[PDB]
Design a protein around this nucleic acid. Structure first.
Ligand SMILES: [Mg+2]
Ligand SMILES: [Zn+2]
Lengths: 148, 49, 82, 1337, 50, 81
DNA sequence: CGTCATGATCATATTATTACGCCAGACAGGG
DNA sequence: CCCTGTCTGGCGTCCTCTCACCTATGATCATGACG
């Protein structure tokens, strides 16, 4: 029935028209399939997913950046990415990826001064969320410390 | 959605895995130009001072 | 710059390459030392690996030059004092 | 600051007072007139500090020359508000209170400290019993628990010096009056003197706790809280919801409940308690503290709103949504962004497209620095407003900061280590990330809406690590095998498959050409068709000279497309890599040979040029799929009608009563399988060779240029099955039972499908989707457990210095050789130096890495078994040496000193877990010599060779030394051949009965009955409808105790009445019988060999790999022989039947209760050896470890998991599974404590006891000997000498309580503790830093 | 207007989109013939016939 | 426990005439106590109680430096300790 | 001027179960 | 004390995006209106 309706119009029977090229202006071999397809635009647009953050706001209880897009936030450098950087020999990239860029507040203000002055260098320090872990374990009957 | 003239051919890699390659004739005709509306609220609260 | 293969051919560890090139780029960027190869407005990282590929920098030559240019500073201080 | 250890212990009440700056006394939080807090409630100011910096509550000090002085009005030290993040307060509990983590952690530390069960302690601690303290010279004991009437008795008769209390005061008096020295001496003396195994195990656990409690500095009464800490107020924040109210956090609710109940208890102890009354309030306080420390561990939890239980402290440390897995191991990160990916094929493979807006927002402070370094803004604020306005100069600044600065691209499910790569950005007008297509083979990323995230390396060392270690040109080999990961995926192999073929007559046929240059000039002008065979002249460079390229020239009979491709191939390769069809495997090994000949840089630029010309000629091809491309066979209808006539025949045979239901069902499914295969064969001929074209002579046929045939034959998308479903019938689908529908789907997708056929297709499809969902759910947790059991193993030396390695032989299931020697002994250092069978002639030295030339020289000489050094048999203390690992997979050379191989190994095993599944005789093929292994054979009367062993393994030795067939041979099987003989192909050489266990003999004599009394031992059951009856031998159950202790035996004798002995040994010849024997030949018949004395009646997926690495025991363990020698029976049926093994040189009295439901193997007169089986079934791994060795269990694990990964068609090299098996069997148990300080049943880690007896034995002492035990990976990871690793893994409560009472002291020991604490990993560059730091110690 | 990719058809077995494509081209062929018979200002008899 | 604690015939008789002390209580509003503020412009610090009103207000102890000015407030107005 | 009714504002924790599943190790039941 | 059943503890993928929801009811006190 599709063939008989393509025969009513003067279209080719097999549905395939030979098509020229726009750049070269010379014919594509082995004639190609054209027609009309009914295509839908979905509302997963690209200027609703795209996001970027240099330095925004920081969370209150653990001094790490906020999450999401409406809150101007940074992407979660999750656990499997930490495994994938342990799997290379990248050691300084992971150290700044979880001490300087993320958590340590004096470390990141030293970093921001050092970046706007041209000196690429990090003063590491300690994650502040590890001090939160010390306060939560210490708030039990447990006595966690840091020796030496 | 809308019905458009489609061809099945590999065209210079720009439709490699599942991608779609669209002429400017589609965007000139203003035919996928969807219209969105955002609601922005602003309340006048009651605080101190 | 695309590959760093010969920079590992001359420093076989591929982890000592990062230390030697970081030490070299820190000497070129903040310390204000001239590059030993003529650049093409490359950044200091690629100039460091480009000096590694010529062979004129590794950890041996960097320790030789830091000891000699520390002895030069202390020698200048001692000849200024006495 | 600087520190090398994190010590954990219990906390004395003086320690909690010395942390604390004040005391919380009231439960109010905020005033809610203002938000100035109430003194001195939870949120305070004079306990915890000022809300605002240098902003005193009263306000009186705010000068720069006036710092240090404290306030007088509110008494608030004008300092900083950061100090409200660190000051703690304390609550003085009015009555002591039992901590819940030491009461109900299973085991109970207060439980097996007091030598008292948990039910008595719970009935004392909740004020509903009485325990005794200071019992005095009365009838009552010390640990005797009482009740109300018994306390009335004890206070009437003994209201004097007798005493007893209840509640936490009584437990505190018990724990304080505990004398630890007396308990140590008494338990050591009892375990010297008692010696009962229940008491042995229980008392050695209690003395382990007491020695770990005495050696540390704890005290027992510190497990009962007197003073309770509060968390600082910034860490329990009070969020506003912008509605005038504070939906509080759960912690302030819990602390408020404890302070309410405690203040009411202070007031009730103040104004006097009504006798037996000051008890309910203390019960309420204990239950409120047990709600605060761990909510829900005690019976039913509390809630605020409405059903959900609210969050205690242990719910903030444990699990997901807690500080270990959500905030400390994976963090949210500044200088990062994310968008939707797209293709853009104009990129080189070390660069990616990235938007101008994202590149301007990620790289802000770089632009600020360049602005105030070039002098276009005075301060930082003018520069910020310039880059907010985006004026015309900052785009030049941005092109000057992007230029040589890598970024990290990341796909969101990172499975293996190629999921994070580093590129050099190119600015794009637009809002997507243009990503190079070949690279998307490693991300497993299509472009149907995938989203990738970019990160920026700030510091200088991170730019060098994202250039030298993580760049997209460096990672071209996978770390799972040696396969390249830059395989050209789909459009480009269609372009190359269309570019180089040949059709028999096209434009420009047979003309000769002066090189590939005018071949391109002929194709671009239309004077010659692209695939038309042509003689050309090529000049190829082969590197026969010593690193110098030799130019040879020739005239190849080839096509035009092959010449136009040949203008792109680099110099060193030969021509016969482009002189074929070039599908997907041909182009993949093309790139493989270009890598292993010319190195790296021509392989990168040649991958780029392959992608460019593949996209270009796939564009010029126009390989379009249509509806006339799927040729229906003309014989589909007649084959369907023949199969339907056959099911009509089986129908009208079924209703005549000749076939059953199951036989009918099997015949119907066999004829539909036959019809499906004939339809598939017909459509495959009508696709591949239908096109006929005249050669300018008469006619000729060729390979077809159909569109869907090239898309299925090149390897772009599809296979034989999917193009079979589009033209032939799509077969028999399954039903949700797992069964299979007898009426198949006789309709393909080119034709229609009616309603029922589409419904059955929906059964299959939704079963597949639910499999993929729950499959991913298990696969991710498998990767987690493997990277948390390995986690730590770093290549830390350069030569261990041992010899013992494992033996690599090619695996032989019993058909074709599945995995050859080249693909197993590729790149691993030899254990013993291989001598060719020209014995005393060395082929390889004993420390030679076996790369590809050496593997070819192994394949030529047909080397039997290259014994090779494995990771599991190493000798390096705290790590693995470099030579026992092998080649650095993903690279070419030996492994570098430092690369963390545990993590890459665990990712390489768990990464194909997404692909896995979830829910008579011996026939020879080849020809060669015949080998037998572990056989006890004898000669029958027929002249053949019959077998008297289950452990017989037949082998087919080929002409050059190795083995191509292996067959497990059953017990009593009959061979048509012998050992060392020669057979031919297709010759069945063995036959047996799988239903009957033959009891064939060795000597030739009469048969008599010994200990066979009729009526009891044997019963009279006449075979009714046949006639040949037998005296049926019964089991131990049916006959009573008059014959239960008498075993029926068949004694093979001679005519003299004696026993014809075994040839060689003077031992007699008699065969004892177990039950269920059907003895055919009765008393008085001469027998020979080969005659049965009696007749005897008789998950492979992702959970299988899980059950291997978890090391579960199976439900039916195949039991093995404990010790060698003869074997016999024991006590009769205490549920099970015993077994007594008596050796020749060993000792007899060992016994084991075998269940008689298992079919046994061994008789009374058979000798066993340790490591040999007693029955059959799946074989437990712990038995392999304790009975056969360590090499046996690592070999068994790698074979049993490689069968799964090769059944699903996945390549994983065996080093990774060997190193996971190294991190499994890491503990050990002591046998003789010796001159060290260990116990007799202690389970200490292996490297500790090996260095201990290495330093004992090196001097003139006697060391300590050991024995190894195998732990499953979750138990091997929870049993560490480092509590932070075992806390970041599963249950945190049990790990922290055990490490708390033990006083355990971590020293940061490897990777994950240093990821926690925020310092360098001791793997890559941080390994050199840690060698420097440890050398300066 | 739009150039798709053919290689998504034999693996991802949605062969219905190619029949939808051919029948859509048939529909537009009938529409083009109506547009040709109406742009030439033809009387209603030939339009009724077609 | 499942049932109420075995109450013997002793405490009941002992609680037949208790409260033989005085006001005592939880030390809140008395003659010489302490009480933090919660409302007004003179809040944020603490205060003391003495002779309050009764069915109207109380007695707040407001003082800065070395001077003090009493300001009758109802206890709802203040924050009873 | 006094009393009653209505309206507005401020103040605390049941209100009077059932549809996961496996493994594992301790606690205890039966003999 | 030696099994053998029961019990209750552990655990069950990653990343992102969107949306709502986050009391109301009862009692007491004060003010106004009507008698
Ligand atoms: Mg997809
Ligand atoms: Zn070793």
């Amino acid at each position: 029935e599709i063939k008989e309706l393509l025969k009513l119009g003067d279209l080719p029977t097999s549905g395939q028209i030979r098509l020229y090229d726009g750049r070269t202006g010379e014919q594509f071999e082995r004639p190609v399939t054209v027609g009309y397809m009914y295509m839908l635009k979905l509302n997963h647009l690209v200027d609703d997913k795209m996001h970027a953050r240099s330095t925004g706001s920081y969370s209150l209880v653990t001094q790490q950046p906020l999450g999401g897009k409406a809150q101007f936030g940074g992407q979660r450098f999750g656990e499997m990415e930490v495994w994938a950087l342990e799997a290379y020999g990248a050691a300084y990239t992971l150290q700044e990826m979880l001490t300087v860029k993320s958590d340590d507040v004096n470390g990141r203000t030293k970093m921001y001064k050092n970046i706007v002055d041209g000196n690429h260098q990090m003063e590491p320090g300690m994650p502040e969320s590890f001090n939160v872990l010390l306060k939560e374990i210490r708030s039990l009957g447990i006595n966690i410390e840091l020796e030496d | 959605g809308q019905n458009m003239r489609v061809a099945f051919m590999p065209w210079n890699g720009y439709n490699f895995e599942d991608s779609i390659l669209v002429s400017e004739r589609v965007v000139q005709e203003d035919r996928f130009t969807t219209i969105h509306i955002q609601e922005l609220a602003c309340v006048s609260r009651d605080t101190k001072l | 710059r695309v590959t760093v293969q010969d920079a590992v051919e001359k420093i076989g560890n591929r982890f000592d390459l990062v230390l030697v090139a970081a030490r070299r780029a820190r000497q070129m960027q903040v310390g204000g030392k001239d590059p030993l190869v003529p650049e093409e407005n490359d950044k200091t990282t690629v100039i460091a690996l480009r000096e590694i590929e010529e062979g004129l920098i590794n950890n041996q030559i960097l320790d030789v030059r830091e000891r000699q240019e520390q002895q030069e500073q202390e020698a200048a201080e001692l000849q200024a004092v006495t | 600051e600087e520190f090398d250890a994190i010590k954990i212990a219990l906390a004395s009440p003086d320690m909690i007072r010395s942390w604390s700056f004040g005391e919380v006394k009231k439960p109010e939080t905020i005033n809610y007139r203002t938000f100035k807090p109430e003194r001195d409630g939870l949120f305070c100011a004079r306990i915890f500090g000022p809300v605002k910096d240098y902003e005193c509550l009263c306000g009186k000090y705010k000068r720069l020359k006036h710092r240090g002085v404290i306030c007088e009005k509110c008494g608030v030290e004008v300092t900083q508000t950061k100090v409200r993040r660190e000051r703690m307060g304390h609550i003085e509990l009015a009555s002591p209170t039992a901590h819940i983590w030491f009461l109900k952690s299973l085991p109970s530390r207060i439980g097996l400290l007091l030598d008292m069960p948990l039910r008595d302690i719970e009935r004392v601690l909740y004020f509903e019993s009485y325990v005794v303290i200071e019992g005095g010279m009365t009838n009552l004991e010390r640990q005797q628990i009482l009740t109300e009437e018994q306390y009335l008795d004890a206070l009437e008769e003994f209201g004097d010096e007798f005493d007893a209390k209840m509640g936490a005061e009584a437990i505190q008096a018990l724990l304080k009056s505990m004398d630890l020295e007396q308990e140590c001496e008494q338990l050591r003396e009892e375990l010297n003197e008692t010696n009962s195994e229940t008491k042995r195990k229980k008392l050695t656990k209690r003395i382990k706790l007491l020695e770990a409690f005495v050696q540390s500095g704890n005290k027992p009464e510190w497990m009962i809280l007197t003073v309770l800490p509060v968390l600082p107020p910034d860490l329990r924040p009070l969020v506003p919801l912008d509605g005038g109210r504070f939906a509080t956090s759960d912690l302030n609710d819990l602390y408020r409940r404890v302070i309410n109940r405690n203040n009411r208890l202070k007031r009730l102890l103040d104004l006097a308690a009504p006798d037996i009354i000051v008890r309910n309030e203390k019960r309420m306080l204990q239950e409120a503290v047990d709600a605060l420390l761990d909510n829900g561990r005690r019976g039913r939890a509390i809630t605020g709103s409405n059903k959900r239980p609210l969050k205690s402290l242990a719910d903030m440390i444990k699990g997901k949504q807690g500080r270990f897995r959500q905030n400390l191991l994976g963090k949210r990160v500044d200088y990062s962004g994310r968008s939707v990916i797209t293709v853009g094929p104009y990129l080189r493979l070390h660069q990616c497209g990235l938007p101008k807006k994202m590149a301007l927002e990620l790289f802000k402070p770089f632009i600020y620095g360049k602005l105030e370094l070039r002098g276009l803004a005075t301060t930082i604020k003018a520069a910020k407003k310039m880059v907010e306005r985006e004026e015309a100069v900052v785009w030049d600044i941005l092109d000057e900061v992007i230029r040589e600065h890598p970024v990290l691209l990341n796909r969101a499910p990172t499975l293996h280590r190629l999921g994070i790569q580093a590129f050099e950005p190119v600015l794009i007008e637009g809002k997507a990330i243009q990503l190079h297509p070949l690279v998307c083979a490693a991300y497993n990323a299509d472009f149907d809406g995938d989203q990738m995230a970019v990160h920026v390396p700030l510091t200088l060392e991170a730019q060098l690590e994202a250039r030298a270690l993580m760049m997209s040109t460096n990672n071209i080999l996978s770390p799972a095998n040696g396969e390249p990961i830059i395989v050209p995926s789909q459009d480009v192999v269609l372009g190359l498959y269309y570019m180089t073929r040949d059709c028999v007559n096209a434009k420009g046929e047979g003309m000769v050409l002066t090189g590939p240059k005018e071949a391109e000039r002929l194709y671009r002008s239309g004077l010659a068709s692209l695939h038309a065979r042509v003689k050309v002249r090529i000049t190829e460079y082969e590197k026969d000279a010593n690193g110098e390229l030799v130019a040879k020239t020739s005239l190849k009979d080839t096509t035009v497309g092959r010449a136009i491709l040949w203008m792109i191939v680099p110099k060193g390769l030969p021509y016969s890599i482009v002189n074929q069809a070039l599908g997907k495997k041909a182009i993949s090994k093309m790139l493989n040979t270009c890598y292993r000949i010319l190195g790296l840089k021509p392989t990168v630029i040649f991958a780029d040029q392959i992608m460019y010309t593949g996209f270009a000629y796939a564009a010029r091809s126009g390989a379009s799929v249509g509806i006339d491309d799927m040729v229906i066979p003309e014989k589909k209808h007649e084959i369907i009608s023949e199969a339907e006539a056959e099911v009509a025949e089986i129908q009208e045979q079924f209703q005549s009563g000749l076939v059953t239901a199951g036989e009918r069902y099997n015949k119907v499914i066999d004829i539909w399988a036959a019809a499906n295969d004939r339809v598939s064969k017909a459509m495959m001929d009508n696709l591949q060779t239908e096109t006929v074209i005249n050669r300018d002579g008469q006619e000729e046929k060729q390979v077809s240029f159909n569109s869907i045939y090239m898309m299925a034959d090149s390897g772009a998308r599809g296979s034989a099955a999917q193009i079979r479903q589009l033209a032939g019938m799509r077969g028999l689908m399954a039903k949700p039972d797992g069964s299979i529908i007898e009426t198949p789907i006789t309709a393909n997708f080119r034709e229609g499908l009616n309603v029922l056929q589409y419904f059955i297709s929906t059964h299959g499809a939704r079963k597949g989707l639910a499999d993929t969902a729950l499959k991913t759910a298990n696969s991710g947790y498998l990767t987690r457990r493997l990277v948390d059991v390995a986690q730590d193993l770093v290549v830390t030396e350069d030569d261990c210095g041992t010899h013992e390695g494992i033996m690599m032989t090619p695996v032989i299931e019993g058909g074709d050789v599945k995995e050859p020697l080249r693909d197993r002994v590729l790149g691993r250092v030899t254990a013993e130096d291989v001598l060719k069978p020209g014995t005393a002639d060395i082929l390889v030295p004993r420390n030679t890495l076996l790369h590809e030339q050496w593997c070819d020289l192994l394949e030529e000489n047909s080397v039997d078994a290259v014994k090779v050094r494995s990771v599991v048999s190493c000798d390096t203390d705290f790590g693995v040496c470099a030579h026992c690992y092998g080649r650095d997979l993903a690279r070419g050379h030996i492994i570098n000193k430092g690369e963390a191989i545990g993590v890459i190994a665990a990712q390489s095993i768990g990464e194909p877990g997404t692909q896995l599944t979830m829910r008579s005789s011996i026939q020879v093929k080849n020809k060669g010599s015949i080998k037998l292994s572990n056989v006890k054979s004898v000669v029958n009367s027929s002249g053949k060779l019959v077998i008297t062993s289950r452990n017989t393994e037949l082998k087919l030795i080929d002409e050059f030394g190795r083995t191509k067939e292996s067959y497990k041979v059953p017990y009593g099987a009959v061979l048509a051949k012998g050992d060392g003989e020669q057979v031919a192909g297709g010759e069945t050489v063995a036959n047996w009965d799988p239903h009957t266990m033959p009891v064939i003999t060795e000597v030739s004599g009469f048969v008599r009955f010994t200990d066979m009394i009729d009526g009891q031992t044997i019963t009279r059951q006449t075979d009714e409808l046949t006639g040949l009856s037998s005296l049926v031998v019964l089991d131990s159950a049916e006959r009573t105790a008059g014959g239960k202790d008498l075993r029926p035996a068949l004694k093979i004798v001679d005519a003299q009445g004696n026993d014809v002995l075994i040839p060689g040994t003077d031992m007699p010849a008699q065969y004892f019988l177990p039950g269920k024997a059907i003895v055919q030949l009765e008393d008085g018949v001469q027998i020979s060999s080969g005659d049965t004395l009696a007749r005897i009646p008789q998950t492979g997926g992702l959970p299988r790999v899980a059950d291997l690495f978890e090391a579960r025991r199976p439900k039916e363990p195949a039991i093995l022989a404990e010790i060698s020698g003869i074997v016999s029976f024991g006590k009769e049926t205490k549920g099970k039947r015993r077994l007594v093994i008596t050796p020749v040189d060993g000792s007899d009295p060992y016994e084991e209760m075998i269940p008689k439901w298992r079919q046994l193997n061994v008789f009374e007169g058979e000798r066993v050896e340790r490591g040999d089986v007693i029955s059959d079934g799946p074989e437990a791994p712990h038995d392999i470890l304790r009975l056969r060795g360590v090499h046996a269990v690592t070999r068994y694990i790698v074979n049993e998991v490689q069968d799964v990964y090769r059944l699903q068609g996945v390549k994983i090299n065996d080093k990774h599974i060997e190193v996971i098996v190294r991190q499994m069997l890491r503990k050990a148990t002591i046998v003789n404590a010796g001159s060290s300080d260990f116990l007799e049943g202690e389970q200490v880690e292996y490297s500790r006891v090996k260095i201990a007896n290495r330093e004992l034995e090196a001097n003139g002492k006697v060391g300590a000997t050991y024995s190894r035990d195998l732990l499953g990976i979750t138990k091997a990871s929870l049993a560490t000498e480092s509590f932070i690793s075992a806390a970041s893994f599963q249950e945190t409560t049990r790990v922290l309580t055990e490490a708390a009472v033990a006083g355990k002291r971590d020293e940061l020991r490897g990777l994950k503790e240093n990821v926690i604490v925020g310092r360098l990993i001791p793997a890559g560059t941080g390994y050199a830093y840690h060698q420097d730091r440890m050398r300066r110690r | 207007d739009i150039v798709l990719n053919p290689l998504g058809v034999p693996s991802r077995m949605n062969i219905g989109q190619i029949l939808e494509t051919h029948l859509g081209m048939a529909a537009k062929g009938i529409g083009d013939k109506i547009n040709a018979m109406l742009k030439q200002q033809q009387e209603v008899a030939k339009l009724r016939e077609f | 426990g499942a049932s109420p604690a075995i109450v013997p015939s002793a405490v009941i008789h002992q609680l037949s005439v208790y409260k033989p002390k005085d006001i005592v209580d939880p030390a809140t509003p008395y003659p010489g106590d302490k009480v933090i503020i919660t409302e007004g412009a003179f809040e944020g610090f603490q205060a003391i109680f003495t002779e309050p009103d009764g069915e109207a207000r109380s007695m707040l102890l407001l003082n800065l430096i070395n001077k003090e000015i009493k300001h009758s407030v109802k206890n709802t107005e203040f924050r009873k300790l």
